[PDB]
Design a binder for these strands. Sequence first.
DNA 1: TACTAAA
Lengths: 612, 161
Amino acid sequence: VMKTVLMVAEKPSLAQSIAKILSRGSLSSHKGLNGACSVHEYTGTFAGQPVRFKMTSVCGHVMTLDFLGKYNKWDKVDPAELFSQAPTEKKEANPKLNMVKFLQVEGRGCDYIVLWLDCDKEGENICFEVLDAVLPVMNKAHGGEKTVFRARFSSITDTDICNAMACLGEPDHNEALSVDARQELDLRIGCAFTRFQTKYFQGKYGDLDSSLISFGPCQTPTLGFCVERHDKIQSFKPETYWVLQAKVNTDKDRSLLLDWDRVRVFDREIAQMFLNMTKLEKEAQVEATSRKEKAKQRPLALNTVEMLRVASSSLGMGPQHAMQTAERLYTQGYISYPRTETTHYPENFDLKGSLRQQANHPYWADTVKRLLAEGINRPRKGHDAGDHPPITPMKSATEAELGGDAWRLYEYITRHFIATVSHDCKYLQSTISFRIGPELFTCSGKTVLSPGFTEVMPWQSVPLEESLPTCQRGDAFPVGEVKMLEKQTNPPDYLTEAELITLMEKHGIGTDASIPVHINNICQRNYVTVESGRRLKPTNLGIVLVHGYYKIDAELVLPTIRSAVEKQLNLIAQGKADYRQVLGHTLDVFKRKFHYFVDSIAGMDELMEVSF
Amino acid sequence: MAQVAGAALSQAGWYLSDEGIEACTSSPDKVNVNDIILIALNTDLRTIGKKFLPSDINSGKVEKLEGPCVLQIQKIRNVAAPKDNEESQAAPRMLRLQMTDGHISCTAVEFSYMSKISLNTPPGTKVKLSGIVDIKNGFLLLNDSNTTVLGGEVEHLIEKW
DNA sequence: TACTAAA
Ligand SMILES: [Mn+2]
């Protein structure tokens, strides 16, 4: 008699959290026939009637897009037929999870279905897959009323969840058929270009046999940055500085090394004249004195891009390795969700409670105990994106429980969190300016007045420098030696992983869960090889591939087509244009590029001959 | 008269040859020193100049330059910034001006920050050096207290390239 | 045999 309402979330953690919020603590939770997706049951009032609530979670995209079997054989049909004469269906991602069968079995008798997926894009696609899977299972509607309900929320809070339960909406088919079109375009471009490339280049050169040449709307733009950096390094003409420096002795054993105000001159004759006006002199006079107090701003909340950047730069970890370590930590229940964009702590976040967990560790015993006595500084106001709260420590840990890989990532997360709550570093800057003849010189130093987040992140510290001697205007000191420094301009170094992530995020090439994969893809396909300092070095195969792309059609490497084609697809989401025309038109424009690619492939082959 | 106009230019500071000054004169009619100066300013100095720079200036045999003198600027390059990055702010601006008179070319350096002369100054512009100028190592030292830009309307040859 | 991008 008791009707049942099924709810579905996008992850087990969100499922459990929402079930706990709704049920007031009356969970009845058990694993399903997956081992990774659970089912929580309770009772409530829905549409003014006492019913049962059953809630579960999918594990991401239930389904993905793939051609039929025949057109996957790579030889029956040329890639030219993939654009228009190739049907596409949907298969299951992670077939070991049996998620489609799980949603089949859970739902037999659920009169109403309620949805709790994320409000961003790539959530409407998942919700419509879940609907298309579960609809032929439920007990229909006895009357003419409705059953399918979509719930919209911005953050995991009691008030937001209650409001989302109060007001109920509907799924957006127009928004789903934008990510659907993007998936179809990605497949039909990156599977019609890579086949031609690996059947043309592998069919002529023996050194490239049994090797894969891949093209994609993200992989090739990612390689473009490294190739551009390599081009800038290769085409560089060093010049010749001429910097003049001086020494001043105050009393004894204190020789201040000055710096030129005109920091450089690109002329030997001018440098020689300036030396000649200075070296035959033996007195320097003070003219200025500044004791301005400055401050170093504490870091914001940890984001996934910042975590990957710091893991690459300092911890010496690759992006995918760092992501896997963070995922293992989150699954084990130590840190919270490691794929975010937010940088603002929510209002209800129990900072005092979470910071009390690390009150016994030997590394932070002094800092945490102090910070809990004179009050905690409020976190910096950063950015909010409606995603999960930032990566913060959730349970106590020690080097014994964790390994040599997860502990280091945990150490940075629990140190970045404390620095976000502590004070700022207030350092007093003292600058003294002398006058050795007509020219000017200055000396600067820093002294720390009250270290803040420095004591928890020692690597981001104001360096220890000797205090400047006391001197007011009108004091004269003896002069030592003055000479030129024939420095030379140095070429830029190769592209690092940290710098690439910023470049990736600026142009929106990849999402938070796709940045590590794209960087790994170009490193596992011999396009780019890693080196010391986590630097990316383009290889011979990568250099010839991107350079040939510029000669043929620059609209395949430029880091603007991916953002631009997404803007065109937003027209379907906003309802201005229908699904068929935009996909049909954007497929036709890419069909002309492929035919222009095949007829001009000899332009790229000329470059490969020198390489291989 | 022609002699009166020549004398007037003589104390004005312009030093131009006889061919140049009969070139600047519109006609043997009533022409004022103002229009003579304007016409000369328009014309390129390399064809109207005289031999008034003391010569050997590129060497160290000359100490200082006196009197109000009119000179033209050929090339301006920022010696505090590299060729590739001509707008870098890592160094204060400091310009080297190749300064011609039509016969002998000297080199001047910006010793104190000016505002009138900039990198976007058309070649052929003229400056006046009234005051005392220091010739240190064969280089003129330009200060805001002895340099006055008089503008210029000459056929541009750079065209931003 | 692969391919593409993404939760
Ligand atoms: Mn999302």
